[PDB]
Amino acid sequence: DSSRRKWNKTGHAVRAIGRLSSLENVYIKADKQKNGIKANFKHRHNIEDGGVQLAYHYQQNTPIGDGPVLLPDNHYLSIQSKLSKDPNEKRDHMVLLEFVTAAGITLGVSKGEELFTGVVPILVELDGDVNGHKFSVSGEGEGDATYGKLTLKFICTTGKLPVPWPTLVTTLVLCFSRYPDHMKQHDFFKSAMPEGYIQERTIFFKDDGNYKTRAEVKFEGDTLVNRIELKGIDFKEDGNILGHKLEYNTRDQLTEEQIAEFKEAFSLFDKDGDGTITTKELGTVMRSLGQNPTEAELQDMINEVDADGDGTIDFPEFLTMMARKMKYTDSEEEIREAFRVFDKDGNGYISAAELRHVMTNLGEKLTDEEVDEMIREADIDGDGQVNYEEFVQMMTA
Ligand SMILES: [Ca+2]
Ligand SMILES: [Ca+2]
Ligand SMILES: [Ca+2]
Ligand SMILES: [Ca+2]
Ligand code: NA
């Protein structure tokens, strides 16, 4: 419709500012005390019946040998994962496809790099204990660091896995990231090879238990091996983990129709129509929505999604970030933040006088009739206003 596709335009623009304002990548820092790196990241797991389970990761990497290593400046890795099932497999199993790419240093090789120039066989061995429920996982596949590509099949060798597969993905080889030519001096992971590194994590599942991991990642001959011990404590008997309430698969399906909604939202930011979004342009939309960021914040927000590191959001970089932002569910707190962009008085209801103060402050002419058509489209209980539960309907597939 002509008032339906005025929701998507305004809604996508807000979800996009949401994405630009959060921290979704794997942030790496030098740790000179340990001759190593530290990392941290927020992972999302879709809850089958709706909502999201967050898993907050802290990470530490330590060389096994005394060789010199590369200690990087601050960057991040960007990871895209697809989970699938092997149709001829009786055993509890996971087929995993990962792409891993290093970015985050805008445009201004160790001996280990050389072991990754081609396709490297991969072996993974995990022993686990969560709340006393013990399990082992075996995996095999191969990695191509040229393209940051990993393929792996994993078996549960103990029978039924006591936790959902998706919760083990982060634990079950960042030495296969594609690093740009300008960032090769920052690849610690390959630098440690072949003697290897210790990778330790702690993973906090919000409102539930935590995992502790210790892994040896090294060459055993010509194979890259990941040997992992995992311990989980304090999990709820009927939480999302132990009660197996998380989506396995997470559809990867952007319709032609959705891409086109992304473009219309994109064009709100790209006011000069040159196919990219500058700090100036991002700033302009955000001031117009109340917020008032610095040049420094805008550079950081753009850096979160700047694949090519040119200091702008290219249309493709935008399509990518919006794709991700539809694959994984937002938190209540994130949707709340979205709502408050419309809900200026904080009373918990979007008036028709609130929707306009957004729309005519975002450079849109519209009669006090098409406004009322917007409200009507979203308003189920009929009060002529938009409450939180109503908003949450507008902001979904
Ligand atoms: Ca532009
Ligand atoms: Ca760019
Ligand atoms: Ca209000
Ligand atoms: Ca209502
Ligand atoms: Na163990």
Tab-separated table of C-alpha atoms in Angstrom, residues 80-377:
chain	number	residue	atom	x	y	z
A	80	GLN	CA	28.363	-14.734	8.537
A	81	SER	CA	27.241	-18.289	9.547
A	82	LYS	CA	24.772	-20.697	7.851
A	83	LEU	CA	23.647	-23.851	9.737
A	84	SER	CA	22.091	-26.828	7.811
A	85	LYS	CA	21.376	-30.618	8.211
A	86	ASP	CA	22.966	-33.497	6.186
A	87	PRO	CA	19.860	-35.451	4.979
A	88	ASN	CA	21.687	-38.911	5.102
A	89	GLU	CA	22.750	-38.506	8.823
A	90	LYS	CA	21.067	-40.476	11.702
A	91	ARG	CA	23.361	-39.000	14.430
A	92	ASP	CA	22.740	-35.568	16.083
A	93	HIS	CA	24.908	-33.297	13.889
A	94	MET	CA	25.539	-29.738	12.582
A	95	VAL	CA	26.650	-28.701	9.066
A	96	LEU	CA	28.265	-25.229	9.357
A	97	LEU	CA	29.319	-22.713	6.629
A	98	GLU	CA	31.219	-19.607	7.948
A	99	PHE	CA	32.729	-16.544	6.196
A	100	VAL	CA	35.237	-14.593	8.414
A	101	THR	CA	36.516	-11.149	7.334
A	102	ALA	CA	38.781	-8.634	9.083
A	103	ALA	CA	37.907	-4.897	8.812
A	104	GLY	CA	37.717	-1.745	10.981
A	105	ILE	CA	41.020	0.002	10.048
A	106	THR	CA	40.111	2.559	7.256
A	107	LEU	CA	42.639	2.964	4.359
A	108	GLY	CA	45.588	5.139	5.659
A	109	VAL	CA	52.838	-11.046	6.100
A	110	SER	CA	54.269	-13.441	8.781
A	111	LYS	CA	55.760	-16.967	8.191
A	112	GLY	CA	52.384	-18.312	9.519
A	113	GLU	CA	50.312	-16.648	6.724
A	114	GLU	CA	52.107	-19.075	4.321
A	115	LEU	CA	50.358	-22.185	5.857
A	116	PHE	CA	46.942	-20.701	4.797
A	117	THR	CA	47.583	-19.749	1.066
A	118	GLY	CA	45.539	-22.861	-0.019
A	119	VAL	CA	42.748	-25.180	1.297
A	120	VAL	CA	43.667	-26.615	4.755
A	121	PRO	CA	41.949	-29.676	6.274
A	122	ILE	CA	40.343	-28.958	9.718
A	123	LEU	CA	39.712	-31.259	12.730
A	124	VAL	CA	37.668	-30.236	15.850
A	125	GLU	CA	37.349	-32.306	19.079
A	126	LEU	CA	35.182	-30.972	22.008
A	127	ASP	CA	34.467	-32.518	25.456
A	128	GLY	CA	31.673	-30.739	27.375
A	129	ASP	CA	29.844	-30.672	30.748
A	130	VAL	CA	26.828	-28.314	31.245
A	131	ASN	CA	25.081	-28.503	34.683
A	132	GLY	CA	26.568	-32.060	34.888
A	133	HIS	CA	25.155	-33.227	31.472
A	134	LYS	CA	28.372	-34.401	29.652
A	135	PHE	CA	28.888	-34.648	25.843
A	136	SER	CA	31.584	-34.881	23.094
A	137	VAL	CA	31.551	-33.399	19.571
A	138	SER	CA	33.790	-34.445	16.647
A	139	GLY	CA	34.062	-32.283	13.502
A	140	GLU	CA	35.930	-32.200	10.177
A	141	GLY	CA	35.990	-29.891	7.143
A	142	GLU	CA	38.340	-27.409	5.489
A	143	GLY	CA	39.185	-23.691	5.506
A	144	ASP	CA	40.185	-21.298	2.670
A	145	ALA	CA	41.720	-18.168	4.267
A	146	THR	CA	41.957	-16.571	0.786
A	147	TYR	CA	38.100	-16.143	0.918
A	148	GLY	CA	37.700	-16.451	4.744
A	149	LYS	CA	35.631	-19.619	4.012
A	150	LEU	CA	35.120	-22.579	6.457
A	151	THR	CA	32.939	-25.703	5.892
A	152	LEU	CA	32.505	-28.204	8.793
A	153	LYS	CA	30.264	-31.153	9.747
A	154	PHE	CA	30.059	-31.891	13.531
A	155	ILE	CA	28.740	-35.115	15.186
A	156	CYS	CA	27.575	-35.518	18.806
A	157	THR	CA	29.506	-38.771	19.634
A	158	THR	CA	27.660	-39.210	23.025
A	159	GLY	CA	24.108	-39.424	21.558
A	160	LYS	CA	21.736	-36.440	22.074
A	161	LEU	CA	23.375	-32.999	22.585
A	162	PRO	CA	22.159	-31.581	25.943
A	163	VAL	CA	22.399	-27.934	24.588
A	164	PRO	CA	21.265	-26.431	21.234
A	165	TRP	CA	23.870	-26.685	18.418
A	166	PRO	CA	23.830	-22.892	17.753
A	167	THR	CA	25.221	-22.312	21.331
A	168	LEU	CA	28.424	-24.295	20.373
A	169	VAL	CA	29.156	-22.533	16.974
A	170	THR	CA	31.457	-19.802	18.461
A	171	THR	CA	33.361	-22.523	20.407
A	172	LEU	CA	33.665	-25.162	17.604
A	173	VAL	CA	39.260	-21.230	14.064
A	174	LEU	CA	39.674	-17.431	13.506
A	175	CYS	CA	43.109	-18.274	11.940
A	176	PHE	CA	41.033	-18.615	8.678
A	177	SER	CA	39.786	-14.916	8.565
A	178	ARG	CA	40.409	-13.046	5.316
A	179	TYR	CA	42.622	-10.066	6.279
A	180	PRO	CA	42.867	-7.266	3.675
A	181	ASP	CA	46.354	-6.441	2.256
A	182	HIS	CA	46.408	-3.235	4.437
A	183	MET	CA	45.738	-5.250	7.693
A	184	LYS	CA	48.039	-8.327	7.264
A	185	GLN	CA	50.377	-6.904	10.040
A	186	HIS	CA	47.308	-7.278	12.412
A	187	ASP	CA	46.631	-11.094	11.921
A	188	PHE	CA	47.835	-12.515	15.295
A	189	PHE	CA	46.043	-15.862	14.676
A	190	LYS	CA	48.109	-17.014	11.622
A	191	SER	CA	51.319	-15.423	13.132
A	192	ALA	CA	51.135	-17.923	16.079
A	193	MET	CA	51.114	-20.844	13.606
A	194	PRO	CA	52.233	-23.529	13.430
A	195	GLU	CA	52.968	-24.060	17.217
A	196	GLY	CA	49.441	-22.553	17.758
A	197	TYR	CA	47.492	-20.508	20.381
A	198	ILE	CA	45.361	-21.132	23.525
A	199	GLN	CA	41.877	-19.628	22.964
A	200	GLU	CA	39.963	-19.173	26.277
A	201	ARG	CA	36.367	-17.778	26.444
A	202	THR	CA	33.623	-17.078	29.003
A	203	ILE	CA	30.115	-16.780	27.492
A	204	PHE	CA	27.241	-15.181	29.481
A	205	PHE	CA	23.783	-16.253	28.214
A	206	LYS	CA	21.627	-13.360	29.499
A	207	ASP	CA	19.006	-14.457	32.108
A	208	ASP	CA	20.679	-17.947	32.186
A	209	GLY	CA	24.023	-19.798	32.687
A	210	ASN	CA	27.552	-19.270	31.317
A	211	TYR	CA	30.051	-21.466	29.392
A	212	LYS	CA	33.838	-21.523	30.111
A	213	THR	CA	36.043	-22.732	27.167
A	214	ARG	CA	39.773	-23.522	26.760
A	215	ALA	CA	41.027	-24.586	23.264
A	216	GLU	CA	44.390	-25.565	21.717
A	217	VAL	CA	44.396	-24.364	18.039
A	218	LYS	CA	47.548	-25.693	16.241
A	219	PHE	CA	48.886	-27.638	13.234
A	220	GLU	CA	49.118	-31.417	13.776
A	221	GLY	CA	50.994	-32.169	10.548
A	222	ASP	CA	49.135	-30.441	7.681
A	223	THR	CA	45.758	-30.411	9.554
A	224	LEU	CA	44.514	-27.476	11.675
A	225	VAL	CA	43.157	-28.909	14.970
A	226	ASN	CA	40.847	-27.225	17.526
A	227	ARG	CA	40.809	-29.268	20.814
A	228	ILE	CA	38.227	-27.802	23.264
A	229	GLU	CA	37.119	-28.439	26.891
A	230	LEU	CA	33.776	-26.711	27.800
A	231	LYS	CA	32.063	-26.266	31.234
A	232	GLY	CA	28.581	-24.758	31.779
A	233	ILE	CA	27.123	-23.935	35.248
A	234	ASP	CA	23.937	-22.270	36.622
A	235	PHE	CA	21.632	-23.049	33.600
A	236	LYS	CA	17.819	-23.019	34.172
A	237	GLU	CA	16.154	-26.491	33.778
A	238	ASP	CA	13.538	-24.869	31.427
A	239	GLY	CA	15.551	-21.899	30.019
A	240	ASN	CA	16.256	-21.411	26.263
A	241	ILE	CA	19.466	-23.563	26.416
A	242	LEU	CA	18.535	-26.628	28.563
A	243	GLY	CA	14.860	-26.489	27.347
A	244	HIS	CA	16.037	-26.331	23.636
A	245	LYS	CA	13.904	-23.227	22.729
A	246	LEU	CA	16.270	-21.648	20.090
A	247	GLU	CA	15.863	-21.726	16.237
A	248	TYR	CA	18.376	-24.059	14.496
A	249	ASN	CA	18.246	-22.766	10.923
A	250	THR	CA	17.357	-18.981	10.659
A	251	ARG	CA	16.063	-18.488	7.025
A	252	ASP	CA	18.620	-16.561	4.822
A	253	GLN	CA	15.801	-15.368	2.484
A	254	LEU	CA	15.785	-11.666	1.333
A	255	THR	CA	12.982	-11.269	-1.306
A	256	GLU	CA	13.507	-8.837	-4.269
A	257	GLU	CA	10.580	-7.074	-2.456
A	258	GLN	CA	12.648	-6.549	0.792
A	259	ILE	CA	15.873	-5.370	-0.943
A	260	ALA	CA	13.611	-2.667	-2.539
A	261	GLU	CA	12.304	-1.578	0.939
A	262	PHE	CA	16.011	-1.360	2.028
A	263	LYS	CA	16.794	0.924	-0.992
A	264	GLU	CA	13.886	3.339	-0.185
A	265	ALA	CA	15.203	3.618	3.436
A	266	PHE	CA	18.779	3.916	2.108
A	267	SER	CA	17.635	6.898	-0.062
A	268	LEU	CA	16.441	8.766	3.055
A	269	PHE	CA	20.131	8.896	4.180
A	270	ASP	CA	21.608	9.222	0.657
A	271	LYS	CA	20.072	12.692	0.046
A	272	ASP	CA	22.467	13.537	-2.889
A	273	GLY	CA	21.764	10.121	-4.570
A	274	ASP	CA	25.468	9.220	-5.187
A	275	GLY	CA	24.914	5.667	-3.761
A	276	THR	CA	26.859	6.219	-0.489
A	277	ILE	CA	26.084	7.661	3.004
A	278	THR	CA	28.641	10.191	4.487
A	279	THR	CA	29.011	11.341	8.182
A	280	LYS	CA	27.386	14.645	7.004
A	281	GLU	CA	24.358	12.726	5.611
A	282	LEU	CA	24.068	10.278	8.603
A	283	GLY	CA	24.327	13.270	10.987
A	284	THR	CA	21.571	15.145	9.056
A	285	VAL	CA	18.964	12.324	9.509
A	286	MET	CA	19.926	11.829	13.188
A	287	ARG	CA	19.759	15.542	14.225
A	288	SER	CA	16.344	15.523	12.417
A	289	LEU	CA	15.256	12.623	14.787
A	290	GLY	CA	16.298	14.532	18.000
A	291	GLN	CA	19.777	12.894	18.551
A	292	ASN	CA	22.924	15.116	18.173
A	293	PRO	CA	26.130	13.089	17.553
A	294	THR	CA	29.791	14.278	17.150
A	295	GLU	CA	31.891	13.843	13.951
A	296	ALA	CA	33.795	11.148	15.984
A	297	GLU	CA	30.593	9.123	16.786
A	298	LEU	CA	29.468	9.241	13.125
A	299	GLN	CA	32.914	7.948	11.957
A	300	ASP	CA	32.583	5.089	14.536
A	301	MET	CA	28.982	4.291	13.543
A	302	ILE	CA	30.040	4.123	9.867
A	303	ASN	CA	33.186	2.119	10.781
A	304	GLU	CA	30.871	-0.657	12.224
A	305	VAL	CA	29.677	-1.552	8.684
A	306	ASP	CA	32.398	0.001	6.347
A	307	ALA	CA	33.507	-3.264	4.592
A	308	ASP	CA	35.886	-1.444	2.122
A	309	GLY	CA	37.076	1.134	4.792
A	310	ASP	CA	36.520	4.277	2.547
A	311	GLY	CA	34.685	6.159	5.395
A	312	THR	CA	31.169	5.849	3.864
A	313	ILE	CA	28.236	3.330	3.846
A	314	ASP	CA	28.126	2.053	0.203
A	315	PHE	CA	24.683	0.814	-0.897
A	316	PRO	CA	25.951	-2.833	-0.801
A	317	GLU	CA	27.420	-2.358	2.742
A	318	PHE	CA	23.943	-1.008	3.768
A	319	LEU	CA	22.098	-3.955	2.081
A	320	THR	CA	24.444	-6.297	4.025
A	321	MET	CA	23.831	-4.634	7.462
A	322	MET	CA	20.006	-4.543	6.890
A	323	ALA	CA	20.083	-8.251	5.818
A	324	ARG	CA	21.891	-9.232	9.121
A	325	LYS	CA	19.464	-6.951	11.080
A	326	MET	CA	16.458	-8.993	9.672
A	327	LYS	CA	18.135	-12.460	10.163
A	328	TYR	CA	18.435	-11.961	13.956
A	329	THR	CA	15.730	-10.628	16.315
A	330	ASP	CA	16.252	-7.344	18.235
A	331	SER	CA	16.222	-7.269	22.093
A	332	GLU	CA	13.224	-5.680	23.937
A	333	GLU	CA	15.699	-2.835	24.929
A	334	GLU	CA	16.553	-2.291	21.173
A	335	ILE	CA	12.836	-2.194	20.106
A	336	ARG	CA	12.167	0.121	23.122
A	337	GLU	CA	14.949	2.460	21.763
A	338	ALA	CA	13.196	2.446	18.343
A	339	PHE	CA	9.755	3.268	19.885
A	340	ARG	CA	11.191	6.203	21.894
A	341	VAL	CA	12.216	7.825	18.547
A	342	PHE	CA	8.430	8.245	17.836
A	343	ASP	CA	7.267	8.456	21.533
A	344	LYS	CA	8.660	11.937	22.495
A	345	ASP	CA	6.601	12.357	25.740
A	346	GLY	CA	7.591	8.797	26.980
A	347	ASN	CA	3.898	8.036	27.837
A	348	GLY	CA	4.168	4.623	26.029
A	349	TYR	CA	1.873	5.527	23.045
A	350	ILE	CA	2.650	7.109	19.610
A	351	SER	CA	0.052	9.918	18.986
A	352	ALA	CA	-0.765	11.077	15.385
A	353	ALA	CA	0.884	14.427	16.442
A	354	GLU	CA	4.055	12.370	17.300
A	355	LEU	CA	4.160	10.415	13.958
A	356	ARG	CA	3.901	13.806	12.104
A	357	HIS	CA	6.622	15.581	14.250
A	358	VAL	CA	8.867	12.680	12.990
A	359	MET	CA	7.589	12.608	9.357
A	360	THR	CA	7.655	16.435	8.569
A	361	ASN	CA	10.988	16.665	10.588
A	362	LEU	CA	12.380	13.877	8.264
A	363	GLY	CA	11.462	15.977	5.141
A	364	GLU	CA	8.071	14.378	4.172
A	365	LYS	CA	4.910	16.344	3.138
A	366	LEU	CA	1.697	14.417	4.132
A	367	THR	CA	-1.920	15.549	4.937
A	368	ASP	CA	-3.345	14.935	8.485
A	369	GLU	CA	-5.300	12.203	6.533
A	370	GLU	CA	-2.389	9.937	5.318
A	371	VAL	CA	-0.921	10.300	8.895
A	372	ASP	CA	-4.239	8.884	10.242
A	373	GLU	CA	-3.926	6.044	7.581
A	374	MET	CA	-0.443	5.201	9.012
A	375	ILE	CA	-1.895	5.025	12.617
A	376	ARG	CA	-4.934	2.989	11.320
A	377	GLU	CA	-2.604	0.445	9.556
